[PDB]
Structures are given as structure tokens and as C-alpha cells.
Amino acid sequence: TTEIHPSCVTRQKVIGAGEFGEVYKGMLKTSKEVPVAIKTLKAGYTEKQRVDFLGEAGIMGQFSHHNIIRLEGVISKYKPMMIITEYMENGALDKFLREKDGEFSVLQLVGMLRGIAAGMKYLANMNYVHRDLAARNILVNSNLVCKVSDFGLSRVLEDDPEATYTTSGGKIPIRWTAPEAISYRKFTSASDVWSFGIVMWEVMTYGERPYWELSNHEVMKAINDGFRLPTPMDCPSAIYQLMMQCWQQERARRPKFADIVSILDKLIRAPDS
Numbered sequence: 001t002t003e004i005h006p007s008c009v010t011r012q013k014v015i016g017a018g019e020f021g022e023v024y025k026g027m028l029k030t031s032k033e034v035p036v037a038i039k040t041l042k043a044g045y046t047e048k049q050r051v052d053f054l055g056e057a058g059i060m061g062q063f064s065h066h067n068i069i070r071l072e073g074v075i076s077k078y079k080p081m082m083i084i085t086e087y088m089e090n091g092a093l094d095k096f097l098r099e100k101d102g103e104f105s106v107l108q109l110v111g112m113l114r115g116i117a118a119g120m121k122y123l124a125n126m127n128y129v130h131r132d133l134a135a136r137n138i139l140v141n142s143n144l145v146c147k148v149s150d151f152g153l154s155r156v157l158e159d160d161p162e163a164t165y166t167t168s169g170g171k172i173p174i175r176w177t178a179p180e181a182i183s184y185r186k187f188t189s190a191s192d193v194w195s196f197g198i199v200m201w202e203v204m205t206y207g208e209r210p211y212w213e214l215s216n217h218e219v220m221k222a223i224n225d226g227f228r229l230p231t232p233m234d235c236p237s238a239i240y241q242l243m244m245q246c247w248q249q250e251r252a253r254r255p256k257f258a259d260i261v262s263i264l265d266k267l268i269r270a271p272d273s
């Protein structure tokens with residue numbers, strides 16, 4: 001990661017805040033200034049927290065792709081510590097699609113899915129398994145470009161610092177996670193492809209919550225009994241068929257992300273479907 005000089009960074013507007021810290025909109029001088037998001041580490045912290053905060057930035061900094069959020073740099077030597085990323089004017093996809101209910105064409109929605117799939121193909125080619133692929137972790141810019149991110153919603157601290165038992169390795173998003181990853185913690189790019197099919201269903205419902213009528217255990221039983229998410233209204237058959245292939249029980253049968261990009265490219269270049 002690049003260390004950013006604090007003089008080059010300006011915070012202008014608060015986007016959100018929690019016990020983790022805060023997120024700001026601001027400007028960065030690379031030398032004209034560019035808009036950025038600025039994630040801060042809350043005071044005070046623990047040396048695992050600070051190393052984990054910086055270590056997550058190190059992971060993000062390894063990637064360079066149009067459909068992966070870009071790391072501009074970090075401030076680690078001064079307080080508050082900061083992760084400084086590319087700015088995404090439309091925020092998280094799930095919220096964006098609920099705000100824009102019914103307002104996009106099918107070709108526009110499929111273009112979003114292609115962008116997500118192209119980001120995931122890059123990650124797969126880097127041997128990176130995301131494990132939390134969901135519309136809430138897809139960011140959207142003004143041009144409607146969709147980019148993969150992982151703010152770390154799965155890794156927030158909710159464990160007492162003195163608890164005998166703690167969560168380790170993060171919590172699991174059951175509604176987005178492939179069955180073999182829930183059962184054996186077998187996380188692979190193939191289990192990310194299952195999650196991608198769930199993202200496809202989020203997009204085509206303009207942000208419905210998957211299995212929303214069902215408790216987390218109600219979801220797991222429904223799945224192993226063979227239930228799959230239903231065909232959204234106005235979802236083309238070819239898109240729903242792609243979803244079902246991502247949700248194949250045997251992971252060796254799911255498409256690879258490279259295949260998903262190609263399938264979506266061909267559809268975009270020739271509707272029908």
C-alpha cells in the first residue's frame with residue numbers, strides 16, 4: 001500500500017459511522033484533486049485491530065481492475081488512521097436498486113451483472129476467494145459501473161474482549177453461501193459463483209432480500225430439499241437459467257466466472273434474451 005501524506009487529503013462529508021469508525025467523502029491530491037472515500041479506524045483500538053485494519057488495505061491494494069474498488073492509499077503513521085479508496089457516487093448496489101425500483105432496462109441490469117462478474121473473474125484469476133459476495137458489497141459509480149468490494153460487514157467485533165468463545169474467521173452470510181461452504185467451510189471460487197447467482201437474483205428483483213420470508217434455518221432446509229429462488233417478474237429466461245446453473249449442488253458443475261462473463265457478453269450483444 002501507498003502511504004498518503006495527510007496534507008493531500010481533505011475530509012468533506014460523513015457518509016456513515018459505526019463502532020468500527022467512520023466513512024467520509026473527501027478529496028485527494030495526487031499531483032486536479034479526485035473524490036475519494038475515506039474509512040477511518042475508530043479510537044481507540046487494539047493492535048490486532050490496527051494490524052487487521054491495515055492488513056485489509058494491503059489485501060485490497062493487491063488488485064487493479066476496472067470492476068474492483070481501487071485503493072488510493074493509507075494513512076498509518078498519523079491519527080486517525082485512514083483507508084482511502086475510489087469514490088462511488090451511487091453507493092451500495094442493493095440500496096441503489098431499491099431506490100431505482102423498476103427504472104432500468106433489462107440490458108442495463110445485465111450490464112451490471114457483467115461488471116460484477118468481470119471483477120470476480122479477476123479475483124478468481126488471482127486465487128482470491130471473496131466469501132461475502134452480495135449486492136451490499138457491490139458499489140456503483142455515477143456511470144452505473146459496478147465494482148466488487150469488501151468493507152468487512154462480516155468481520156465486525158461483537159465479541160466481548162473477555163469471552164471464552166469468540167467468532168474466528170468471520171461470520172457467514174447464510175443466504176448467500178454455497179451449501180458446501182456452510183457445511184464444510186469449503187470456500188472456493190466455485191462457492192463464490194453460487195453467491196453470484198444470489199446477486200443475480202438481487203439485481204433482477206431490484207434488491208429483494210433473498211428468502212426473505214424464511215429464518216436462517218428455514219433457508220438451509222429449503223435449499224437442501226431442493227428449493228431455489230423463484231424466477232423474478234420480467235427476468236428473461238436465459239438470465240434465470242444462468243442463475244440456476246450457479247446454484248448447482250455439485251460445485252464442479254457451476255460455471256466459472258470467465259464463462260459467466262462470456263455468456264453475459266453474448267446476451268448483451270444479441271437480445272433476445
Ligand SMILES: CN1CCN(C2CCN(C(=O)Nc3cc(Oc4ccc(NC(=O)C5(C(=O)Nc6ccc(F)cc6)CC5)c(F)c4)ccn3)CC2)CC1
Nearest residue numbers: 023037039056057060086087088089090091148149150151
Ligand atoms: C443515492 N445517493 C445516496 C446518498 N449518497 C451516498 C451513498 C453512499 N455512498 C457511498 O457509500 N460511497 C462510497 C463509500 C465507500 O466506503 C467504503 C470504504 C472502504 C471500503 N472497503 C474497504 O475498506 C476494504 C475492501 O473493500 N477490501 C476489499 C476490496 C475488494 C476485494 F475484492 C476484497 C477486499 C477492506 C479494505 C468499501 F468497500 C467502501 C467507498 C466508495 N464509495 C456514495 C454517496 C449519494 C447517492
